[PDB]
Design a protein around this ligand. Structure first.
Ligand SMILES: C[C@@H](O)CN1CC2=C(C1)c1ccccc1Nc1ccccc12
Ligand SMILES: *[C@@H]1O[C@H](CO)[C@@H](O)[C@H](O)[C@H]1NC(C)=O
Length: 333
């Protein structure tokens, strides 16, 4: 019956990491995961893990009655780091939906960057076209069940605060308690990737970048808004922000006066004020404040592209429509 509309509560770790809980096996073994529209594979650390594994929950296949062996070796390369392991199959529970899934048991999890990760693994919300080993993604297997009210999933990311809700993922629809107004939809360029066409990025009331059009990957697993090194250099010059490591900074006192950043997607302009992209941790003229925007040279086929991560998602509640191959945005509350 197509009437299921399940949700997973997320935890906000310092506006950079948003993770929820999944259960693997019989009885269920729980894991903190990132739900990533940028990738299409499910992976958690394995009990068979020989640097970062000490700090994370490990999947023990020998404690699962529903486990089915596979063992195909697998390497999952990310913009942040790389993991390796082998494939396994078991039952996975995501907010009351149970699915037989092929996932990766990770045996190579480096302390850089995974020691910094508050989550154990990743649940890829991408398409099979981007899946490593051509492994069927979890959302495709939920679709096949015919339980969902709609072949959609939504993301709400809150601003860090207090016993408030860090975020929420809705499988089968959207939560109108978390958005204002109505959704505006933009069709995907092509199926296989959660990427839409962008028609310009403007600083203030004038179009500075992406004048001849560019790409925007709507990435739930990205912490920040990102662009090509060249684009981010031009943007940061316009903002009067200076480079300090892989971070861009402004003097904390100058933060509240930085201009609005606008992304032209579909029919409209999606605007971020300085309060949306500056980590305003002080207001002193002596201290330096971090911007939630950075350079990221995404390699082909996906890149060169901009990526609208948690910085964007916090402002705009996002709906990912698999039935219509489109992305919807509405102002978040
Ligand atoms: C939660 C989401 O909004 C942002 N996340 C995604 C993510 C982050 C931060 C990260 C944090 C600390 C260390 C490493 C990583 N790298 C990594 C690798 C693979 C897949 C996802 C990640
Ligand atoms: C693992 O799963 C893949 C799925 O394509 C299958 O082709 C392969 O034969 C399986 N391997 C084992 C050892 O079960």
């Amino acid at each position: 019956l197509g009437n299921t509309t399940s949700s997973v509560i997320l935890t906000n770790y310092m506006d950079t990491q948003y993770y929820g809980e999944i259960g693997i096996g019989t009885p269920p073994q729980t894991f903190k995961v990132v739900f990533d529209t940028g990738s299409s594979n499910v992976w958690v650390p394995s009990s068979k893990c020989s640097t970062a594994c000490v700090y994370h929950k490990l999947f023990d296949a020998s404690d699962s009655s529903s486990y089915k062996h596979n063992g195909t070796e697998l390497t999952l390369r990310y913009s942040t780091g790389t993991v390796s392991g082998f494939l396994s199959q078991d039952i996975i529970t995501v907010g009351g939906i149970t699915v037989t899934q092929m996932f990766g048991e990770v045996t190579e999890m480096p302390a850089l960057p995974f020691m910094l990760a508050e989550f154990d693994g990743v649940v890829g919300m991408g398409f099979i076209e981007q899946a490593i080993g051509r492994v069927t993604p979890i959302f495709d297997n939920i679709i096949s069940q015919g339980v969902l009210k709609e072949d959609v999933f939504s993301f709400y990311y809150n601003r860090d605060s207090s016993q408030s809700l860090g975020g929420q993922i809705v499988l089968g629809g959207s939560d109108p308690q978390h958005y204002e107004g109505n959704f505006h939809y933009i069709n995907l360029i092509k199926t296989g990737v959660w990427q839409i066409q962008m028609k310009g990025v403007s600083v203030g009331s004038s179009t500075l970048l992406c004048e001849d059009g560019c790409l925007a990957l709507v990435d739930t697993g990205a912490s920040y808004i990102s662009g090509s090194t060249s684009s981010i250099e031009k943007l940061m010059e316009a903002l009067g922000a200076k480079k300090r490591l892989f971070d861009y900074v402004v003097k904390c006192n100058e933060g509240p006066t930085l201009p609005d950043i606008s992304f032209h997607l579909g029919g409209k302009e999606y605007t971020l004020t300085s309060a949306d992209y500056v980590f305003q941790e002080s207001y002193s003229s002596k201290k330096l404040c971090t911007l939630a925007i950075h350079a990221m040279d995404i390699p082909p086929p996906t890149g060169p592209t901009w990526a609208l991560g948690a910085t964007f998602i916090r402002k705009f509640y996002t709906e990912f429509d698999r039935r219509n191959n489109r992305i919807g945005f509405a102002l978040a509350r």
